[PDB]
Structures are given as C-alpha cells and as structure tokens.
C-alpha cells in the first residue's frame, strides 16, 4: 500500500504536469479543438479520481 | 515535518511557493513572444 500510494502520487504529479502544459495549449489552439476537448475532459476526470485515490490511500498508508 | 510517505516529494515542496512569482515573469515572456504590441 505504501509503494501503491507513492506510485499514485507520482502519477498525479505527472498528470498535473501534463495538464498544466497542455490545457492552455489546447485552449489557445482553435484548429485541433475537438480531440483536445475530449482529452481535457478525460484528464480532468482522471485528475479528480487520482486526487481522491491519493487521499484515501493516504488514510490507508 | 511532512508525513513520511510524502517525504520523497520533499524537494518539490521546497520549490512550490516560488511558483506564483514565475507567473509574473511568464506574463513578460508572453509579451516578449508577441513583440509587446
């Protein structure tokens, strides 16, 4: 559970870096907006789920 | 100290509060990209 929580937190850091780089890029690129919007929705759902997972795994670790 | 399971991300926290300052710098960088129009 310790290494699982560590991996989930590192994944949250990586995904937050990806969203921080990508979301202003996707917002300011009108040409490729449809797949960008789909990826943004997927990333936001994944980020919220990873935050909740990190919290509950923190309570377990 | 932080909880021990977070200790491996202790250096990242060490640079976290400086991030808003960079935001100010980023604005100038953005203006440098557009020629300060």
């Amino acid at each position: 559970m310790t290494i699982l929580f560590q991996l989930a937190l590192a994944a949250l850091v990586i995904l937050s870096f990806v969203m921080v780089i990508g979301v202003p890029v996707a917002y300011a690129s009108p040409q490729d907006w449809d797949r960008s919007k789909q990826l943004i929705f997927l990333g936001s759902g994944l980020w919220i789920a990873l935050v909740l997972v990190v919290g509950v795994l923190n309570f377990f670790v | 100290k932080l909880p021990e399971a977070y200790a491996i991300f202790d250096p990242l926290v060490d640079v976290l509060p400086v991030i808003p300052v960079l935001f100010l710098a980023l604005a100038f960088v953005w203006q440098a990209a557009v020629g300060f129009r």
Binding site: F17, V20, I21, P24, V25, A28, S29, P30, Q31 | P11, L12, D14, V15, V18, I19, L22, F23, A25, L26, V29, W30, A33, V34
Partner: peptide, 28 residues
C-alpha cells in the same frame, strides 16, 4: 541538486508553453 532540477523543470514549463503556442501558431 533535486531542488535545482525541480526549479529547472517548473521554470521551463511556462516558456515552453509559449514556445509550443508560437511554433504551432495560435492566439498568443
């Protein structure tokens, strides 16, 4: 060294957002 590398990565996050938007031309 870890603090310095973290500083470097966060400091290249923003300017390379600007770089990506400039090269892949968009509304900067």
């Amino acid at each position: 060294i870890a603090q310095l590398t973290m500083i470097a990565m966060i400091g290249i996050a923003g300017p390379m957002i600007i770089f990506l938007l400039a090269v892949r031309r968009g509304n900067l």
